[PDB]
Design a protein around this ligand. Structure first.
Ligand SMILES: Nc1nc2c(ncn2[C@@H]2O[C@H](COP(=O)(O)OP(=O)(O)O)[C@@H](O)[C@H]2O)c(=O)[nH]1
Length: 304
């Protein structure tokens, strides 16, 4: 499948730059912004400046109606950049003028172009104020109506994973990992024919028109490795939507030749027990002999 990651506005384009710097192989990046200064510095191969008639090449100055109109007026350019995608991840920080208004338009276009469309967006820090939060909430609601599945990261959760000295840019990279892991997990599932295979049609069944989503990867080794990996896959502190209530799950377990039936069952039970629900299990298994003693559990959960 052709996977694309589209960053919309400042924070979304930040995430695209950091992900390209980190390294990401078979994924096309697209950078969309009103802010031409920031776009000029993007590392993405595909860049779309939107709304230059509206903003004269600046940002949207905290007005989401300008981000929205900018995206609508560049619809054809956005279609052309998306065309061919089977799956699109639209990432954006909600609460500003460009992302809040343009990201739901971009997502709507991607879904109308036939792409499985996942939004990964932030809510602003409480320190940014109540009206930024209210503006962001309208963006989140518009995003939810425009995507297949939505992952919301409240930026306040970053305050739960730092100490008093953690550089702000290091905290931002942690939030990127939510998107990177989801993209990488799907990429890796598509690329290999598993002993019990999952492919893009399984991703579509779990993610299409399902609302809120969780995506996680956990890795462990040694004793209780499978349970530990499964718990890590479902336990991110940054997510608005936890695993509790999932009624839809794609789960893949990858290990070396030692991967046991028993421990795969243990892993499957961890997900359903934390789900506290009757959940939609599509379960896959991959034997990767180069893994030795490590196990990797990938989880996509929906149905909330
Ligand atoms: N986690 C994270 N949040 C960001 C980042 N940049 C901006 N934000 C958040 O995104 C919101 C909108 O900022 P920005 O994307 O620059 O606005 P826009 O360009 O007008 O869409 C801000 O109010 C912050 O809450 C980033 O790199 N990481």
């Amino acid at each position: 499948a052709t996977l694309k990651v589209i960053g919309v506005g400042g924070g979304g384009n930040n995430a695209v730059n950091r992900m390209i710097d980190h390294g990401m192989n078979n994924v096309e990046f697209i950078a969309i912004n009103t802010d031409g200064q920031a776009l000029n510095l993007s590392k993405a191969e595909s860049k779309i400046q939107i709304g230059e008639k509206l903003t004269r090449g600046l940002g949207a100055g905290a007005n989401p109606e300008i981000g929205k109109k900018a995206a609508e007026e560049s619809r054809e350019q956005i279609e052309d950049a998306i065309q061919g995608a089977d799956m699109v991840f639209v990432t954006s920080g909600m609460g500003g003028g460009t992302g809040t208004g343009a990201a739901p338009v971009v997502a709507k276009i991607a879904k109308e172009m036939g792409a499985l469309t996942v939004g990964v967006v932030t809510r602003p820090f409480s320190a940014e104020g109540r009206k930024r939060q209210t503006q962001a909430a309208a963006g989140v609601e518009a995003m939810k109506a425009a995507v297949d599945t939505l992952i919301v990261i409240p930026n306040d959760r970053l305050l739960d994973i730092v100490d008093k000295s953690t550089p702000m840019m290091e905290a931002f990279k942690e939030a990127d990992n939510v998107l990177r892991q989801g993209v990488q997990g799907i990429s890796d599932l598509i690329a290999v024919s598993g002993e019990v295979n999952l492919d893009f049609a399984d991703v579509k069944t779990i993610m299409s028109n399902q609302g809120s989503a969780l995506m996680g990867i956990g890795v462990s080794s040694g004793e209780n490795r499978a349970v530990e990996a499964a718990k890590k896959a479902i336990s991110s502190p940054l997510l608005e939507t936890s695993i509790v209530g999932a009624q839809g799950v794609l789960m893949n377990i990858t290990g070396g030749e030692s991967l046991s039936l028993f421990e795969a069952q243990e892993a499957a039970d961890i997900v359903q027990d934390a789900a506290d629900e009757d959940v939609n299990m599509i379960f896959g298994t991959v034997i990767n002999p180069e893994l030795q003693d490590e196990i990797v559990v990938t989880v996509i959960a929906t149905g909330f």
